[PDB]
């Protein structure tokens, strides 16, 4: 399979295309579905507030984009069942709208002529992949799969290394995270969630996330062993995840950092840093997660020990590099 | 006089309408609110405000009402104004703050729904349009639907009126450096047809069209067609500033311009004056529509050819709301 | 009425708010002198116009050597060395030390050498009496001359830790505060002392930041000495901050039980508030508490007999902390 | 002359070095003077909040940086007259501290053994160069020259084009500009300038600038014909300049836009756009100024006409590209 439709050409949907070109995937996006015109999609693709100008030529006609000299159809169907995927023969849908995050909802893509769906968010109790953690669980019979959230892709590799080296008995996560499209520009209704209604660039806003709660889908041994949440803050992209764990062994900071370093060695998904970086330094990361040995903290009172480990993530472009790794393998099975 | 008000669109402007009415102990009673959400969520937004802080009065709710300072306010959720049941609590004057009924044709739906008069919190085409303390004497008993134009009009008009009256404005162009609002985007993505409006508002200087100068003739007839302008939307949450560059009808000094302005702001509850070195956060919470800033006045001249730059601040939320309320109170007593 | 005469050293974010709060509560303390590094004109400007709290609620004027605030004169000095401040000229006895440059008993001694009698330091100042009001203020006595009120973070952390310790025991814990940026940080990337991360553009980054709030908690709650660690993530909000604590407690608990204990500890407690509303950081701006526990963020994670308890409290690290500083000051002045 | 020293390794000073490497200049930076350690300078060079990771290797020693393999001496002399520029033979000093903005002040570098100084700011009535407006005025005997401000580099090529095509009779400028290190993070004393004392990322802050007032140093025919100021706003970099003029001829918008387009043709310093860009789209620009045809406004009543023209500028990297063009020419005289 090498024909891709993008449903939802948003922050994630546009960067998917950017990253496919940057890595020279043999995948071809043949169709984009969204809610707008080729003119406006072209403008958005050409000019990006977080990553700067598109590195390839971009033009449009009434019905397509022309990206690096190649044509991509543009549709504007708000219900997925009506999307004409058959027209250009889109095989794998990268479902990036947020409105089809369940196998039953995303079935609509298959009913409409697609063969597979890769959902760019948590999508309940379905197969959910963090690349370089559990991508060996994918087979040729999977049709609709999830790559969870950016926060999952941050948390999972760090949890996996800790669990493998020391065991995690129980833990809780807080991610201090860049604001996203699901939040509000000015104070006003945003569905049912009271905190999501508040001005995002003017507030620290507590925010629910299932990344720890559903980690069992990616690291079966940790099912039910973690909880967590987010604090959304006023940065445009670039985020950090802290995990406080009770481990299966007594450890030093140095031991923990070394075990992590080893986990990140020749691991294109998971990086390491012992530099004094800040969030803007992760913008444009090609990792899903970058463990930061400078923030490791072991609090020990006799037999009791709390371990705080911290990893950075570009919740836009970093997460996208993982989505694309999963896509490229999904495409071959 | 009319005393019962309905608010359509309990948004940034709608909520501050209620706050200001209670603040000035108005005899006007808000008896109903129409929006698209639950009392619960409206109560949460009313209690907790990112720009102005905690609501200064008690807030509770029921399944179909808010209870504000102990007084019950009906809450409806009709997306079409014609369907709002304004007669249930006898709402007489609707303060129309949704942005979706900005014409006479559109807003007369509230009259079909049982109201008596409508005051629109935005420009609404060529209808009677009032900047209080500029042209509020043009209101009369036969006006049924009226506009108070934009925050930018309320900032620009008193400054332009004073310049027009003292010196003449032959021609001018405005630029307002303005706080971002709800019509903009949190992250880069579609926002109707306007390409700039699609960009992340708190991360960019964004050029932005406004009719404030173009439609100024509704408020100052002598300046009809004599002004143009635009906005640069920037990352501040509220508090904005408007610059006007004019060819005036007289050779002037900065001191003469500033004195003329100071005079126009004397005994004027709508239009303030400052010669302090203020910045935008100092205007948040202002009870004026516009505050002229003498420290920014600039006269550029080569021979007879003279450009005059005058600058006024405005709290595009609360300050504008104070103008809306002054107009509302007068409108209720005609 | 005790009419102690106060001097403020460092008329900065905290120093200016100290005056605001004293006037707001109609304190019997008289502020008679201020020392900074600048002119009365500039201090008058900054006092009148505040980016976080708006217009000063009283009149402000200046002369060549004073501020006039609501009609009352306050002498202005500009002595970069505290020993040279003429605190005796207007009789300033209690100095509120808000510069960041005298954060020890030995450094703040200079105010006593200059003729003051007591110093209250608006920051951690090592192993000296360190007070969080309504946690350990009953340790002050008539013999104290130099005392600390620790950091805003300590004032947020301590009341929540004290309630938890008193109700359930805390065996061990780690804190992270997601916190507004302050004057120690940088506007644009550039050198800022030795702290590399402090060099980075504060309104454009999430910046990890060290704080002693957890590590030194034993000054305030002696039973918890050595049992807590923690750090901050500084973020682009101008004021208003939140502190999370993850604890192993001495007994198994439910979220309700933790929230009820905290509720009880906040009852009739002018220093420590409670909320169960879904507030965000701007809702804490101008708080008159040092800390507001947020029951909505309580989380119990348990596997077998292993339990992690996460408890969360807001704080306005400027005005909120200042209200604690003032309560301490008022008591410290009556002894 | 090919050996350079940088005084002030700040936003401008570090980007000077970045741009010299980027263009593979033959200029050799042999020394840097600042107030801090090599360790801290290395960290700042490597990690940049506006422009991301340094594209070359960076290490340090107790008295040096090692950048792309090459040693650069680091001094910490707060008085320029004490900088030991003769040790590594620095001939031309790029003066980027802001503390030596006059001939009399920057003479110190020549006393310290340098031969020439290029000041990264306005510096009074001395030779002042906006590259591709008046760089022809640089002379073999000049030893101290200025490149004015970022705002001047934005305004001048627009003013030159208008003046050449139509005449500017009189004009006034407002730049809506990114905040800079002369401002304050929190409200507090900032020398004598009261507006500069205010929290820069939380305010619109009027700010005086000489860009227009001193335009006659760059375009002598416009001496005394312009005034202007800035409004500093909460964006980290990327700015815009509006100019309102009385021109010597009646014009259409198309005519103004066409004249500006011609002036930008084969002009490495002056770009054009008719795209609906916003400030983030200018970040990383290699122009001193980019005229934006989309904002052109002609306001006419009878025989009176006001003409508003608008150009974008990256007040950091864009201006630095102009500084380096000027330095390259200067070094060969
Ligand atoms: N932004 C992040 O940090 C991030 C990271 C990882 C995963 N995700 C996930 O990826 C998905 C997309 O997030 P995003 O931040 O790009 O959101 P976004 O809001 O930027 O983009 C959504 C896009 O989908 C379009 N859209 C909405 N409804 C549609 C419909 N019915 N049909 C077609 N197009 C539709 C919108 O026009 C928009 O272009 C979400 O499920 C989100 O949870 C986001
Ligand atoms: N924010 C400002 O600076 C400002 C200043 C002056 C005037 N205005 C004008 O006031 C109006 C409101 O602006 P705002 O900033 O308060 O916008 P907002 O988006 O904050 O509020 C709009 C409110 O109306 C509600 N709504 C939308 N469609 C509706 C419908 N069909 N029926 C009932 N309720 C509906 C929304 O739920 C929201 O609560 C606009 O016309 C705007 O131009 C805004
Ligand atoms: N969030 C907060 O801002 C906060 C909260 C609690 C405690 N504190 C503490 O309070 C103190 C002040 O913090 P701030 O935020 O008000 O800092 P600030 O930088 O806003 O204020 C410092 C003031 O001290 C003056 N100053 C510096 N050196 C001086 C000297 N040698 N003599 C006289 N004046 C001098 C400065 O000019 C400035 O006005 C620090 O110790 C800080 O840790 C700050
Ligand atoms: N940032 C901009 O947008 C911009 C654009 C054009 C020109 N400039 C100008 O360039 C100059 C530098 O601006 P910047 O934004 O890089 O400022 P900055 O504050 O970022 O850098 C100044 C550097 O000089 C150092 N320094 C200060 N005093 C010193 C001394 N006495 N000796 C040696 N080093 C010293 C500082 O430690 C810092 O590294 C100024 O003249 C400024 O007007 C700035
Ligand atoms: O509420 C759902 C998400 O947690 C919000 O943002 P996101 O979907 O872009 O990650
Ligand atoms: O709690 C935080 C401190 O009081 C922060 O202080 P600071 O102003 O010294 O950064
Ligand atoms: O424009 C006047 C000041 O010099 C401020 O900023 P800048 O010097 O970095 O341009």
3-state DSSP of A104-134: HHHHHHHHCCCCEEEECCCCCCCCECCCCCC
Is C112 in a helix, a strand, or coil? helix
Give the closest of A199, A242, A300 to C176, CB-based: A242
What is the distance in angstroms between the Cα of B163 and the nearest Cα belonging to chain C? 29
Contact of D121 with D150, CB cutoff 8 Å: no
Q: Which residues of B touch D194 (CB under 8 A)?
A: 277
Task: Give, using CA atoms, the residue closest to atom 27 of ligand 4.
Answer: D97
Q: Which of C91, C74, C93 lies closest to C36, judged by CA?
A: C74
Task: Give the whole-angstrom CA distance, residue B296 versus residue B243.
Answer: 9
Task: Give, using CA atoms, the residue closest to atom 30 of ligand 2.
Answer: B79
Our measurement of the distance from residue C121's CA atom to the centroid of its chain's CA atoms, rounded to an integer in Å, reads: 10
Q: What DSSP state is assigned to residue C141?
A: -
Interhelix angle A11-23/A317-332, nearest 10 degrees: 60
What is the full DSSP assignment across C2-19?
---EEEEE--SHHHHHHH
Secondary structure element (H or E) that encloses residue C154, with its range: helix C152-168
Structure tokens at D257: 């836009």
- Please check whether residue C231 touches A, CB under 8 A: yes
Residue C218 buriedness (CB in 10 A; 0-12 / 13-18 / 19+) = middle
What is the distance in angstroms between the Cα of D51 and the nearest Cα belonging to chain A? 9
Our measurement of the distance from residue D4's CA atom to the centroid of its chain's CA atoms, rounded to an integer in Å, reads: 18
Declared resolution, Å: 1.8
Give the closest of D194, D204, D301 to B225, CB-based: D301
Closest listed ligand to the CA of A209: 5
Please report, for residues C23, C313, D46, the alpha-carbon distance to residue C238 in angstroms, rounded to integers and kept in the order given: 24, 18, 27
Q: Is C11 in the pocket of ligand 3 (CB under 6 A)?
A: yes
Bridge pairing between strands D270-273 and D205-207 = unpaired
Would you say how long chain D is, in residues?
333
Place of tokens 């079935």: A107
Residue A138 buriedness (CB in 10 A; 0-12 / 13-18 / 19+) = middle
Residues with CB under 6 A from ligand 2: A 186, 188-189; B 8-14, 34-36, 79, 97-100, 121-122, 150-151, 181-182, 316-317, 320
How many Cα atoms within 13 Å fall on the side-chain side of residue D268? 8
Contact of B20 with B13, CB cutoff 8 Å: no
Asked how this structure was determined, the answer is X-ray
- Please check whether residue A170 touches B, CB under 8 A: no
Give the closest of D36, D47, D181 to C188, CB-based: D181
Contacting D residues, span 28-47, partner chain A, CB-CB under 8 Å: 43, 46-47
Task: Give the whole-angstrom CA distance, residue C55 versus residue A317.
Answer: 43
Q: How many angstroms is it from B12 CA to the middle of ligand 2?
A: 6
Contact of C229 with A299, CB cutoff 8 Å: yes
Residues with CB under 6 A from ligand 7: D 149, 180, 182, 209
Task: Give, using CA atoms, the residue closest to atom 13 of ligand 4.
Answer: D12
Task: Give the whole-angstrom CA distance, residue C87 versus residue C78.
Answer: 12
Task: Give, using CA atoms, the residue closest to atom 19 of ligand 1.
Answer: A181
Angle value at C-alpha C305, between C300 and C307, nearest 5 degrees: 25
Structure tokens at D318: 């864009």
Task: Give the whole-angstrom CA distance, residue C314 versus residue C18.
Answer: 20
Q: What DSSP state is assigned to residue A184?
A: B
Q: Do D44 and C190 touch (CB under 8 A)?
A: yes
Q: Which of C196, A49, A317, C233 lies closest to D45, judged by CA?
A: C196
Q: Which atom of ligand 7 is nearest to the CA of D121?
A: 8
Task: Give the whole-angstrom CA distance, residue A120 versus residue A130.
Answer: 11
Task: Give the whole-angstrom CA distance, residue C147 versus residue D8.
Answer: 41
Q: Do B284 and C54 touch (CB under 8 A)?
A: yes
Q: Which of C325, C36, C329, C3 lies closest to C155, judged by CA?
A: C325
All chains having 3 or more CB pairs closer than 8 angstroms to chain A: B, C, D
Using most ligand atoms within 8 A of CB, pick from C187, C188, C193 the residue to mutate for ligand 4. Answer: C188
Domains defined along chain B, listed by start: 4-150+321-333 (3.40.50.720), 151-320 (3.30.360.10)
Q: Do A171 and C308 touch (CB under 8 A)?
A: yes
Contacting C residues, span 177-196, partner chain B, CB-CB under 8 Å: none
Q: What is the 3-state secondary structure (H, E, C) of chain B?
A: CCCEEEEECCCHHHHHHHHHHHHCCCCCEEEEEECCCCHHHHHHHHHCCCCCCCCCCCEEEECCEEEECCEEEEEECCCCHHHCCCCCCCCCEEEECCCCCCCHHHHCHHHHCCCCEEEECCCECECCECCCCCCHHHCCCCCCEEECCCHHHHHHHHHHHHHHHHCCEEEEEEEEEEECCCCCECCCCCECECCHHHCEHHHCCEEEECCCCCCHHHCCHHHCCCEEEEEEEECCCCCEEEEEEEEECCCCCHHHHHHHHHHHHCCCCCEEEECCCCCHHHHCCCCCCEEEEHHHCEEEEECCEEEEEEEEEECCCHHHHHHHHHHHHHHHCC
Q: Is the dihedral of CA C225, C229, C233, C234 positive or negative?
A: positive
Q: Which of B16, A205, D310, A321 lies closest to C242, judged by CA?
A: A205
Please report, for residues C258, D304, D312, the alpha-carbon distance to residue A149 in angstroms, rounded to integers and kept in the order given: 31, 59, 37
Phi (first) and psi of residue A132, to 5 degrees: 65, 15
Q: What DSSP state is assigned to residue C236?
A: S
Q: Do C171 and A301 touch (CB under 8 A)?
A: yes
Q: Do D278 and B206 touch (CB under 8 A)?
A: yes
Task: Give, using CA atoms, the residue closest to atom 8 of ligand 5.
Answer: A182
Q: Which residues of D touch C190 (CB under 8 A)?
A: 10-11, 44, 181
Closest listed ligand to the CA of A181: 1
Q: Is C100 in the pocket of ligand 3 (CB under 6 A)?
A: yes
Contact of D117 with D142, CB cutoff 8 Å: no
Please report, for residues B84, B331, C306, D195, the alpha-carbon distance to residue B112 in angstroms, rounded to integers and kept in the order given: 9, 19, 65, 52
């Amino acid at each position: 399979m090498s024909k891709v439709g993008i449903n939802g050409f948003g922050r994630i949907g546009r960067l998917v295309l950017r990253r496919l070109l940057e890595v020279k995937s043999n995948i071809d996006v043949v169709a984009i579905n969204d809610l707008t015109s080729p003119k406006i999609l072209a403008y958005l693709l050409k000019h990006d507030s977080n990553y700067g100008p598109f590195p390839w030529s971009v033009d449009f006609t009434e019905d397509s984009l022309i990206v690096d000299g190649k044509s991509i159809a543009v549709y504007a169907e708000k219900e997925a069942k009506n999307i004409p995927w058959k027209a250009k023969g889109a095989e794998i849908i990268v479902e990036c709208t947020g409105f089809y995050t369940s196998a039953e909802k995303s079935q609509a893509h298959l009913d409409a002529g697609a063969k597979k769906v890769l959902i760019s968010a948590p999508a309940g109790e379905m197969k959910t992949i963090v690349y370089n953690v559990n991508d060996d669980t994918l087979d040729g019979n999977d049709t609709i799969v999830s790559v969870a959230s950016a926060t999952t892709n941050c948390l999972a590799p760090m949890a996996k290394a800790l669990h493998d080296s020391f065991g995690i008995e129980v833990g809780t996560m807080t991610t201090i995270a860049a604001y996203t499209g699901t939040q509000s520009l000015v104070d006003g209704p945003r569905g049912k969630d009271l905190r999501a209604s508040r001005a995002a660039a003017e507030n620290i806003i507590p925010h629910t996330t299932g990344a720890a709660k559903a980690i069992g889908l990616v690291i079966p041994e940790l099912s039910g062993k973690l909880k967590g949440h987010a604090q959304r803050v006023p940065v445009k992209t670039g985020s950090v995840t802290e995990l406080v764990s009770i481990l299966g062994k007594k450890v030093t900071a140095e031991e923990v950092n070394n075990a992590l370093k080893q986990a990140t060695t020749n691991n294109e998904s998971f990086g390491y840093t012992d530099e004094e970086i800040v969030s803007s330094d992760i913008i444009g990361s090609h990792f899903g997660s970058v463990f930061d040995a400078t923030q490791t903290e072991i609090t020990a009172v006799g037999d009791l020990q709390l371990v705080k480990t911290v990893a950075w993530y570009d919740n836009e472009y970093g997460f996208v590099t993982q989505l694309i790794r999963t896509l490229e393998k999904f495409a071959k099975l």
